[PDB]
Amino acid sequence: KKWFSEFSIMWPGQAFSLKIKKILYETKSKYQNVLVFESTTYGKVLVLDGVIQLTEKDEFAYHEMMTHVPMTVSKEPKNVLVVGGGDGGIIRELCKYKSVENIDICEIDETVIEVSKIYFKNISCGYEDKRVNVFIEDASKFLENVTNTYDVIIVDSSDPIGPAETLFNQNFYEKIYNALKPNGYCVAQCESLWIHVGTIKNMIGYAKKLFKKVEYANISIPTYPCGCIGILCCSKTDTGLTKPNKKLESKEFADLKYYNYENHSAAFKLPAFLLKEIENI
Amino acid sequence: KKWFSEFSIMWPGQAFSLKIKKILYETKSKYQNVLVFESTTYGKVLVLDGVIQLTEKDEFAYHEMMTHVPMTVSKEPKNVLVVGGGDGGIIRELCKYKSVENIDICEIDETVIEVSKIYFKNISCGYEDKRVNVFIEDASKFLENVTNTYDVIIVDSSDPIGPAETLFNQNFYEKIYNALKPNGYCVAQCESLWIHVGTIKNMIGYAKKLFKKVEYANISIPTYPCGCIGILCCSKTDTGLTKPNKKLESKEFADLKYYNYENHSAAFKLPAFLLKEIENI
Ligand SMILES: C[S@@H](CCCN)C[C@H]1O[C@@H](n2cnc3c(N)ncnc32)[C@H](O)[C@@H]1O
Numbered sequence: 335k336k337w338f339s340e341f342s343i344m345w346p347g348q349a350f351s352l353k354i355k356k357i358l359y360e361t362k363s364k365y366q367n368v369l370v371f372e373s374t375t376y377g378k379v380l381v382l383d384g385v386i387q388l389t390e391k392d393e394f395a396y397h398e399m400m401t402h403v404p405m406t407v408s409k410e411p412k413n414v415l416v417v418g419g420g421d422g423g424i425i426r427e428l429c430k431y432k433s434v435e436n437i438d439i440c441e442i443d444e445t446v447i448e449v450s451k452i453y454f455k456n457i458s459c460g461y462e463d464k465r466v467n468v469f470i471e472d473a474s475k476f477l478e479n480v481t482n483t484y485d486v487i488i489v490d491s492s493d494p495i496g497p498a499e500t501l502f503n504q505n506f507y508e509k510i511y512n513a514l515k516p517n518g519y520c521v522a523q524c525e526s527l528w529i530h531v532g533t534i535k536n537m538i539g540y541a542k543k544l545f546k547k548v549e550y551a552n553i554s555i556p557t558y559p560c561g562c563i564g565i566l567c568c569s570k571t572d573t574g575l576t577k578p579n580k581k582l583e584s585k586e587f588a589d590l591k592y593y594n595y596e597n598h599s600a601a602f603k604l605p606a607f608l609l610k611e612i613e614n615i
Numbered sequence: 616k617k618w619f620s621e622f623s624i625m626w627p628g629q630a631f632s633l634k635i636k637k638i639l640y641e642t643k644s645k646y647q648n649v650l651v652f653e654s655t656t657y658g659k660v661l662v663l664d665g666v667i668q669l670t671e672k673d674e675f676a677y678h679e680m681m682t683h684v685p686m687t688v689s690k691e692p693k694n695v696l697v698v699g700g701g702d703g704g705i706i707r708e709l710c711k712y713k714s715v716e717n718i719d720i721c722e723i724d725e726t727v728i729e730v731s732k733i734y735f736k737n738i739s740c741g742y743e744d745k746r747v748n749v750f751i752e753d754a755s756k757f758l759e760n761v762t763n764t765y766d767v768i769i770v771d772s773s774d775p776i777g778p779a780e781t782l783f784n785q786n787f788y789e790k791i792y793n794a795l796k797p798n799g800y801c802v803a804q805c806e807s808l809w810i811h812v813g814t815i816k817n818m819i820g821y822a823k824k825l826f827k828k829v830e831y832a833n834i835s836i837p838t839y840p841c842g843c844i845g846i847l848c849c850s851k852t853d854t855g856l857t858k859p860n861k862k863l864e865s866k867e868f869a870d871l872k873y874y875n876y877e878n879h880s881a882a883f884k885l886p887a888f889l890l891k892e893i894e895n896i
């Protein structure tokens with residue numbers, strides 16, 4: 335049995351590996367190298383440009399926090415946009431909300447969706463939902479053109495190297511701000527506090543140039559580098575994204591595996607050194 | 616340049632690796648394989664039985680939380696025991712407290728101490744402190760014999776495979792309970808919630824057989840498996856270890872890099888699935 339190893343200049347000097355039960359599918363799409371394998375212990379795994387995007391074992395942590403942090407703070411979210419997110423995990427979580435009337439997903443790589451419909455049927459099951467509409471395009475362009483505004487935008491992107499490069503700059507955050515309702519929120523994947531402080535400071539400074547409250551939360555998830563990933567959390571009101579406005583009690587949420595009301599606000603209590611780095615931005 | 620890889624049956628199907636700048640020292644001690652290397656990006660690294668024990672980059676997270684969670688809850692801790700902990704990181708953190716009069720450390724492997732005094736001078740600097748006393752012995756035996764009781768016991772052990780095997784059983788938790796003052800506390804390293812749920816349930820059930828409050832906290836630290844490690848948190852009073860009783864404001868604590876008053880209680884807000892697994896113990 336072979337192992338998959340995740341090496342990158344974005345985390346020099348370190349690497350995480352998973353043992354491979356069987357390779358299921360590989361291709362070069364228009365944008366990226368796509369790999370799907372059944373791991374021995376983390377179930378099926380999706381890899382893009384040699385970087386792990388999800389595993390069936392842990393995806394609920396990242397999908398649940400990126401979705402339910404903002405969707406419990408937004409009072410009556412009607413219209414939601416997922417940027418990236420072709421696997422459908424964020425959509426799945428979104429569909430549990432009966433009040434949502436529309437979910438747009440802008441994913442640059444349709445291969446990611448199709449692979450997910452084929453190989454990840456419990457992650458991609460929300461594409462059957464009549465409220466979901468799919469747009470295959472660079473979100474940087476989608477957001478320059480979309481006429482609707484959203485109650486929430488969830489930026490479920492890959493890393494800055496690759497097609498997500500257009501998503502980690504001051505310009506993209508202007509577009510997001512413009513595309514949100516006046517009391518709308520955006521959460522975005524915003525890397526690891528252990529090694530990406532320069533990036534975190536940059537993104538925070540980008541968000542703070544527009545949003546009146548910018549917060550950063552941290553998720554434990556073992557298959558992203560350093561075992562955590564942050565949520566850059568952008569609020570147009572002074573009040574922010576640290577306190578949920580509801581609890582998830584209907585039968586659709588009985589299945590939740592990470593998110594709950596308390597660990598929502600916990601995620602925002604950050605390490606001392608991180609607070610000190612970002613305090614003068 | 617070579618890489619160090621951390622493979623183990625304790626986390627089958629996964630592995631973390633660090634790139635090696637230079638090997639500094641290796642030996643087989645009486646108890647374990649000892650490796651010290653300068654990594655390219657995480658500074659110097661100490662490895663025991665092929666398992667990473669610490670790196671200079673991140674050790675403050677684990678040392679600060681394991682120390683300051685209980686030392687801010689204990690009102691006037693006079694006498695403290697570190698189990699394991701030969702690197703001295705816990706001692707270092709302990710020494711900052713002027714009120715502490717004595718620190719006993721029971722470390723089974725004196726090689727770990729000596730290597731740490733030689734190679735990790737900013738971790739091991741607390742051994743110069745006149746209040747520190749060192750005992751080279753199996754803590755399982757030390758705690759069967761010690762006549763003093765402690766205000767806090769910090770169990771800074773390696774994993775259950777190896778000499779720490781004696782530290783992860785119902786018997787060891789009885790000894791700890793006996794060795795603590797009536798309002799004394801114990802925190803112990805208690806593995807990763809992503810893969811060690813069976814162990815976490817076992818340890819919790821062990822602790823709950825004696826202690827009236829048993830809590831579990833989680834730390835982000837990239838160089839332990841799954842990027843987190845838990846703190847099993849044992850309180851003889853109903854009140855527990857989730858809320859600090861003081862803030863660390865004197866000049867000795869200006870240097871803190873992870874711990875603070877808020878992220879102390881945050882660490883105890885756990886993922887949904889973990890709460891459900893442990894609810895009927
Ligand atoms: C699969 S997903 C994240 C894994 C956990 N849901 C990351 C997606 O972001 C897409 N991505 C990357 N850059 C962009 C842009 N610029 N636009 C839209 N989608 C993008 C990429 O193709 C992945 O499918």
Ligand SMILES: C[S@@H](CCCN)C[C@H]1O[C@@H](n2cnc3c(N)ncnc32)[C@H](O)[C@@H]1O
Binds near residue numbers: 702721
């Ligand atoms: C270096 S330390 C942890 C790394 C972060 N401080 C873990 C120590 O626990 C010791 N250890 C393991 N088992 C025992 C027992 N049974 N007793 C005392 N110390 C032990 C082991 O030799 C390490 O030095």
Ligand SMILES: Cc1ccc(N)cc1
Binds near residue numbers: 386490491559
């Ligand atoms: C969603 C996501 C987060 C981090 C990395 N590295 C890739 C993907």
Ligand SMILES: Cc1ccc(N)cc1
Binds near residue numbers: 772774806839
């Ligand atoms: C302290 C410590 C925690 C976890 C592992 N794996 C080793 C050492």
